[PDB]
TrEMBL record:
GO terms for MF: metal ion binding
Residues the entry annotates as binding Zn(2+): 56, 59, 61
Metal-binding as UniProt keyword: yes
Domain Teneurin-like YD-shell: 246-438, 502-1011
Residue ranges of every copy of the DUF6531 domain listed in the record: 1-70
Keywords: Metal-binding, Repeat, Zinc
Protein name stated in the entry: Uncharacterized protein
């Protein structure tokens, strides 16, 4: 807030200083245009080190860090004892007026000590906590000149002509913290801080700040009326061209923002807003009782009420929907009990010095906390017995952490809080060095030295914003900013630029990619995103209710996604209309229980139900009658046992929560071991399966040993952490060349001969999308394809392939593929035109939510897909040929079962294939089909590369191309493996890799439709990842 709508003041609050310690020492400056107070920073600016108590006849006026005055009635004996002011009931005044006075802050448990000076004025002499940690304020000749902190450091405040010019860390290290300059009338004109902002200020003779600017591009000009009220603001770059209109009779202030909006505020005697109307006419009211919010009602009539106890704290919060929260405190104002809906009660226990020693969750489980005599947290004991331990340096910052497994992490920080070094439980050390720019443009450089020899640089500009970053290979990404620290440009290592543009209220309205095309956003008078147009020209429209909730999404083709919300802002219904006809094409309903927990989701294709326990943990998930039950470890709230159609899995976990044993259906259990860093080093089964893994000093997976039962793998990276060499004992040696954008430009798989067996070469456009792909087999050119993007999506492609004859090459295939998209950005037709041959045309059918519902193969065969209300594909049918189907079962976001369905339409549940994941993970652990158990071995991205029987025999070997095409030949009786990259499932009828939301073309490296979440998933809408061996996309974004 720039302006106090209750009075018209121009307000500013900036951080000045923050020093770590047992008692943190923080300092900020607060400006108010009509203020009559004075702090260490001159007139009109108040701070935390200038608080004072003043005798006012029978009153004791207390000036806080913002110039607000609290009043206290001095008793007859002149002794205060826990005296409280009703306007701010958390400040407590104690002491004899003849001795010294104390202000106790029930919010922080900290005390301010005020000592007598002159004329019945008490100045701040000390601040201390309940542990005795103390900061003594020293004043000489009236001016605050020194500060002593009990941790062992001292501050030196230097003055000249009674104006504060320097705040210096004095001992044990000399360091400049704050520098200040003043104008001709003694107002703070320039304030340079070492941790925060560097600003300049300009005032009139009365002290009204008419201009403030930063080190570079931000510069605001303020105009006042004859009363000192702000009437207009304007920045030099055009932002915040605001105006303010006042009406003291109506008690109404009018705000005219720079984009044509009008917000009106009605205030009361205390200057608090009782009623407001936004530029869209949405009204919000508030009831106050003496600077105390009692109830607030938004634009939908939803009322939130606040109750208070005799001590002045919030005791009861009434929420929309009948929910109520209750708060209980001890005598010092510390929260001791929180009662929530569903009989969820949290309990906090404190000792004699205020340390919270025991915390009890709603499940009655206790966490014990042990402290030092000075307040340091020394030990924490979890309910299962896991014990954490900490020790601290001279500034009471954590310098050593002991994990429950015995590992110790050494950290070291400087007096300003910056991290200097870290030593992991295995002895590997990461160092940080900070250097200041001493020439020209102000700035700083942060160098990182990693235990693998990697060195990285991070440079900040004069506004202490990230200016550039240089990875271990010397690739530099640069950032440019505009006014108000708005990101306006990003420059890749290859030199291409991404640009941003903002309206007069600093709202993102345009994004320009490296190709030069524009993504545009449009807002209404209230700031809601009402329209957006991607690079393809597709425009989507959004509608909102009075509460700001999106109730309609209008697509170019004409369909409407309508939504209805419950009182607790939960989607209860989704309709699909079309055009001017209000007729509903499809319907989706969500049902919630008394605790606003989703218990049933239903559309025309699937019904999903959820069951919970007292702890709101999902005990059962059912999809179309198929039920999965869960049991939880009582102490760790993790899934300890899950059952699906009689088959039961048991999970066992250690103190840290790591998986130690897994077992299914009475088979031999799988046992796992971990190191001191929490990384898996071995997994074994007594049947014979064994897998050892090792890592780099930075934690990168680099080695694998298994045990026709032996597998040696090695992954080697470059100093930018790109996978550039793979040593496989079954496949050979892969070598990768990367570009400045960390994309693979050359990938050669070499067996044992010197000339590589197979090579892939790639080129990319300015959007990092694939353009060229050339293959070479045994040194001779094999195939070469070039594809062209339009607006970020693949549009056409030419492909050729050669045969090696005699030393000549002759063309055997010469095809041109062309893609056609609809107005919603969904691929609807892919046509492969060969020379003279017959055209092969793929067709795609979509619903309103851009889900692939139908697929027509070039041979006329048609398939149909159905989805649940969460976008999970549940069924795959063939609707015109005599071919079997497939049913899918999901646990959350994991595809856990693929169930074959015969041609008669009956699911073969006894022939189901189960994929075992850790609950929440996307890396498959094992595979279970017809009582056969197979253990998986995954690569660096979590993709299955080998399936092994329980005895350790490799029965399936993967062999893929760079972007995911799987083509490794396996025996006929080998188990099927259609899992590709994490989240992907290969449909054998089309070659597509189904991700949860979109379908992926591993040849073009792109999805078949635009990203359903828009810019929330990146600038490239039809793109998978820059490097498929280092990025993953479990969902379809």
């Amino acid at each position: 807030e720039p302006v106090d709508i209750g009075t018209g003041d121009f307000l500013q609050h900036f951080s000045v200083l923050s020093l770590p310690g047992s008692l943190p020492l923080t300092l900020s400056r607060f400006y108010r245009s009509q203020a009559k107070g004075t702090g260490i920073f001159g007139p009109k600016w108040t701070d935390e080190w200038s608080c004072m108590l003043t005798v006012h006849g029978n009153d004791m006026h207390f000036t806080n860090h913002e110039g607000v005055d609290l009043y206290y009635r001095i008793p007859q004996n002149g002794i205060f004892r826990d005296t409280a002011n009703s306007r701010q009931a958390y400040y407590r005044l104690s002491g004899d007026i003849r001795d010294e006075l104390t202000i106790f802050d029930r919010r922080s448990q900290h005390s301010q000590i005020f000592s007598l000076t002159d004329n019945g004025i008490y100045l701040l002499s000390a601040i201390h906590d309940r542990y005795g940690n103390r900061a003594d304020f020293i004043r000489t000749e009236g001016l605050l000149t020194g500060i002593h902190h009990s941790d062992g450091y001292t501050l030196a405040l230097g003055w000249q002509q009674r104006q504060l010019v320097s705040i210096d860390l004095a001992t044990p290290q000399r360091q400049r913290l704050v520098t200040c300059h003043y104008d001709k009338n003694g107002y703070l004109a320039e304030c340079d801080t070492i941790q925060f902002s560097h600003l300049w200020h300009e005032y009139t003779s009365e002290g009204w700040m008419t201009r403030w600017r930063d080190t570079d591009k931000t510069c605001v000009d303020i105009v006042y009326d004859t009363l000192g009220r702000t009437v207009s603001t304007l920045s030099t770059e055009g932002y915040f061209d605001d105006q303010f209109l006042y009406n003291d009779d109506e008690k109404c202030t009018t705000y005219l923002d720079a984009e044509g909006g009008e917000t009106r505020y009605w205030y009361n005697g205390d200057g608090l807003v009782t009623r407001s109307i936004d530029p869209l006419g949405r009204e919000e009211t508030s009831v106050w009782e003496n600077t105390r919010l009692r109830s607030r009602t938004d634009a939908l009539g939803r009322t939130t009420a606040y109750d208070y106890n005799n001590e002045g704290e919030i005791s009861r919060v009434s929420l929309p929907g009948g929910y109520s929260l209750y708060y209980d405190y001890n005598e010092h104002g510390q929260l001791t009990r929180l009662s929530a809906p569903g009989n969820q009660v949290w309990l906090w226990e404190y000792d004699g010095k205020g340390s919270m020693v025991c915390l009890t969750d709603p499940q009655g489980r206790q966490q014990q906390f042990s402290y030092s005599e000075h307040g340091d947290l020394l030990r924490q004991i979890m309910p299962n017995g896991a014990t954490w331990r900490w020790s601290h340096d001279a500034l009471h910052q954590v310098r050593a952490t002991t994990a429950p497994d015995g590992g110790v992490t050494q950290t070291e920080q400087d007096i300003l809080g910056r991290l200097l070094s870290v030593k992991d439980p295995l002895g590997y050390t990461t160092q940080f060095r900070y250097s200041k720019n001493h020439a020209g443009p102000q700035g700083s450089v942060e160098e990182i030295r990693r235990p693998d020899g990697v060195r990285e640089l991070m440079r900040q500009n004069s506004e202490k914003l990230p200016e550039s970053f240089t990875d271990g290979e010397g690739n530099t990404t640069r950032y440019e900013y505009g006014a108000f620290d708005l990101l306006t440009a990003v420059i890749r290592p290859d030199g291409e630029r991404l640009a941003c543009r903002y309206d007069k209220l600093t709202r993102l309205t345009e994004i320009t990619n490296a190709e030069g095309e524009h993504y545009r956003l449009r807002y209404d008078k209230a700031g809601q995103l009402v329209a957006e147009t991607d690079f393809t020209g597709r425009t989507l429209t959004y509608s909102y209710d009075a509460a700001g909730r999106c109730i309609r999404t209008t697509f170019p083709d004409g369909t409407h996604l309508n939504r209805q919300y419950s009182t607790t802002d939960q989607v209860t219904r989704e309709e699909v209309a079309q055009g001017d006809s209000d007729r509903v094409l499809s319907c989706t309903t969500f049902i919630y229980d008394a605790l606003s927990r989703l218990t049933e989701a239903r559309n025309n294709d699937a019904t999903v139900t959820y069951e919970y326990d007292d702890a709101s943990r999902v005990t059962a998930e059912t999809i179309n009658g198929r039920r999965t039950e869960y049991n939880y470890d009582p102490d760790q709230d993790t899934v300890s046992q899950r059952t699906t159609a009689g088959i039961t899995e048991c999970f066992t976990r250690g103190l840290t929560g790591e998986l130690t044993q897994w077992q299914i259906d009475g088979h031999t259990p799988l046992t796992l071991e971990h190191d001191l860093r929490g990384q898996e080093i071995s997994r074994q089964s007594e049947a014979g399966f064994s897998l050892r893994q090792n890592y780099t000093p930075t934690g990168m997976l680099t080695g694998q040993q298994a045990g026709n039962n032996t597998l040696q793998r090695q992954w080697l990276y470059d100093k930018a952490y790109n996978l550039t060499m793979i040593s496989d004992s079954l496949r050979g040696t892969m070598v990768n060349s990367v570009t400045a954008n960390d994309q693979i430009s050359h990938a050669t798989w070499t067996g044992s001969s010197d000339i590589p067996m197979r090579e892939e070469r790639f080129a990319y456009d300015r959007n990092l999308n694939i353009t060229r792909r050339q293959t070479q087999v045994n040194g001779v050119p094999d195939s070469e394809a070039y594809q062209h993007q339009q607006h970020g999506r693949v549009t056409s492609r030419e492909y050729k392939a050669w045969r090696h004859t005699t030393q000549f090459v002759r063309v055997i295939r010469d095809e041109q593929t062309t893609w056609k998209y609809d107005v919603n950005g969904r691929l609807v037709e892919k046509l492969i035109d060969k020379g003279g041959y017959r055209p092969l045309r793929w067709r795609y059918r979509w619903d309103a939510r851009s889900q692939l519902t139908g697929l027509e193969t070039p041979e006329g065969e048609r398939r149909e897909y159905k989805y649940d209300p969460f976008g999970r594909r549940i069924s795959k049918r063939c609707t015109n040929r005599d071919r079997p189907g497939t049913d899918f079962h999901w646990n959350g976001d994991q595809l856990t079962e693929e169930i074959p369905v015969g041609t008669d339409g009956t699911p073969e549940y006894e022939n189901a294939i189960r994929w075992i994941y850790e609950p929440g993970s996307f890396t498959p652990l094992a595979r279970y089909e017809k009582g056969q158990l197979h253990y998986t071995i995954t690569d660096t991205v979590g993709r299955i590369q080998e399936l092994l029987t329980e005895d350790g025999t490799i029965v399936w070997r993967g062999k893929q191309h760079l972007w995911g095409r799987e083509e490794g030949r396996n025996k006929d009786d080998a188990p099927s493996c259609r899992l590709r990259f994490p989240g992907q499932y290969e449909d054998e009828e089309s070659g597509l890799y189904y991700n949860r939301f979109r379908y992926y073309d591993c040849e073009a490296g792109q999805y078949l439709c635009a990203d359903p979440i828009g810019l929330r998933g990146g600038i490239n809408l039809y793109a998978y990842a820059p490097n498929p061996l280092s990025w993953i996309d479990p969902l379809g974004l």
